[PDB]
Amino acid sequence: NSLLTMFRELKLPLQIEQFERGKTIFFPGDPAERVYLLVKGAVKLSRVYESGEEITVALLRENSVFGVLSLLTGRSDRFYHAVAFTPVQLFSVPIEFMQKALIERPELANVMLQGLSSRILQTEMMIETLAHRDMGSRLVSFLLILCRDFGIPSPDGITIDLKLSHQAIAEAIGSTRVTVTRLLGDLRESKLIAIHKKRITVFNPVALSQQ
Amino acid sequence: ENSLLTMFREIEQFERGKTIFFPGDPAERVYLLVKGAVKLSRVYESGEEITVALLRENSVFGVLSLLTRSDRFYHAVAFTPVQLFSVPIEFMQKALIERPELANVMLQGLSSRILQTEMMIETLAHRDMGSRLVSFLLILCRDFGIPSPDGITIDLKLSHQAIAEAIGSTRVTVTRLLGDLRESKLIAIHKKRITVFNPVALSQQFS
Numbered sequence: 242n243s244l245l246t247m248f249r250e251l252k253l254p255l256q257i258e259q260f261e262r263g264k265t266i267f268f269p270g271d272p273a274e275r276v277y278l279l280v281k282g283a284v285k286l287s288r289v290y291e292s293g294e295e296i297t298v299a300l301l302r303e304n305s306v307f308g309v310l311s312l313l314t315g316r317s318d319r320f321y322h323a324v325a326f327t328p329v330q331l332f333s334v335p336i337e338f339m340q341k342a343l344i345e346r347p348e349l350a351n352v353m354l355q356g357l358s359s360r361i362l363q364t365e366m367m368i369e370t371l372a373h374r375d376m377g378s379r380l381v382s383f384l385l386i387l388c389r390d391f392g393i394p395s396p397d398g399i400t401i402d403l404k405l406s407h408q409a410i411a412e413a414i415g416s417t418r419v420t421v422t423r424l425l426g427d428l429r430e431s432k433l434i435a436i437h438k439k440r441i442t443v444f445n446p447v448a449l450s451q452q
Numbered sequence: 453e454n455s456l457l458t459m460f461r462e463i464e465q466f467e468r469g470k471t472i473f474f475p476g477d478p479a480e481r482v483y484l485l486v487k488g489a490v491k492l493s494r495v496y497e498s499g500e501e502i503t504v505a506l507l508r509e510n511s512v513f514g515v516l517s518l519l520t521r522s523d524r525f526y527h528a529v530a531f532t533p534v535q536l537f538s539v540p541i542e543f544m545q546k547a548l549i550e551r552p553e554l555a556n557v558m559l560q561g562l563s564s565r566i567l568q569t570e571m572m573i574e575t576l577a578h579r580d581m582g583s584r585l586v587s588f589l590l591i592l593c594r595d596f597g598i599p600s601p602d603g604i605t606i607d608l609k610l611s612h613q614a615i616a617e618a619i620g621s622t623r624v625t626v627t628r629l630l631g632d633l634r635e636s637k638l639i640a641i642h643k644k645r646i647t648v649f650n651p652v653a654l655s656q657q658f659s
């Protein structure tokens with residue numbers, strides 16, 4: 242909760258911004274002039290290669306601070322591509338307002354420090370996921386992250402609340418569409434997960450951890 | 453600048469291989485790595501290890517403590533000989549509440565670690581093991597590189613096993629790929645240190 246209440250107040254109030262699914266929040270090349278708080282939805286940070294291929298660096302969940310490059314002072318240019326993965330609501334602030342707002346309303350550098358601490362650890366989770374030698378573990382590991390980040394209770398289990406193309410999954414776990422199609426499909430038959438409308442449900446993740 | 457030094461100081465020596473913290477430890481402290489390299493690892497009891505982060509100089513770590521306690525789940529080790537400052541949370545939380553101008557540097561410090569961890573994702577993201585190696589080697593050149601006529605010398609005693617545990621591979625493959633890299637006149641291993649000639653050329657391998 243806390244982060245919302247910090248950002249909002251940052252003399253006139255801060256308006257929430259809407260972003261349609263697929264709309265860019267920032268392009269590689271833009272000046273890194275801003276910090277953001279993702280309020281609702283999912284934002285995908287991606288690295289684009291001159292080769293054409295993209296890699297997902299982070300699928301960020303709600304109440305996440307991002308754009309964090311702007312805090313490094315000296316400005317700089319974005320090198321990642323920030324996109325609304327789902328429909329997105331966020332606050333953005335120019336860097337300077339954050340410097341002062343933190344200084345003055347003192348309690349809340351602690352909220353930003355916790356916000357940023359949260360992000361470091363989450364990324365380190367993603368590394369652990371990407372390091373598994375066998376791709377199936379990666380998938381399961383990734384799916385489990387998506388359950389606690391985007392999971393919504395169903396009668397039939399926990400349901401990752403995202404339109405996830407297999408291609409999307411491919412670009413996050415460092416694989417290809419064909420492999421993930423086969424792995425998923427083999428978790429479907431194993432009665433370990435279920436898929437409808439591009440959304441995945443993992444039964445008893447507690448269990449999926451144990452196998 | 454760095455100036456994180458200048459905040460923290462208001463030093464501990466650690467021997468190559470000594471533990472800074474183990475899983476099971478309480479998460480009661482924050483650290484600033486002043487000199488050397490610290491390796492955060494995840495131990496898959498039972499048996500093997502995976503490197504989550506090789507941290508370079510002037511890095512804040514132990515960051516779990518800032519989440520308000522908990523227990524460490526990673527293993528913090530002096531990869532080289534290490535100099536660091538450590539502070540209990542309470543002194544640090546208090547300090548930041550009493551003197552709330554020292555937060556900007558911490559915010560930049562933590563931002564940097566996010567950006568650096570994201571690099572390691574770019575690396576492990578590659579499907580091709582050779583690209584991972586090159587990607588990883590290049591990071592090590594920025595982070596631990598010394599200058600050198602034709603390129604850059606990673607200033608670490610790096611076992612191939614170490615490299616294996618960072619890039620998600622095995623010792624046999626690293627030793628092999630380094631060979632192919634070497635035999636292409638792209639790196640050298642002299643007095644136990646990897647030197648990568650003309651990295652910028654090689655960094656165009658990606659983009």
Ligand SMILES: O=C(O)CCC(=O)C(=O)O
Nearest residue numbers: 307308309310319320321
């Ligand atoms: O992880 C983030 O917050 C995005 C990184 C960033 O700010 C950039 O690439 O400019």
Ligand SMILES: O=C(O)CCC(=O)C(=O)O
Nearest residue numbers: 513514515516524525526
């Ligand atoms: O990345 C770090 O700072 C170390 C993570 C940590 O503090 C822990 O595992 O307890």
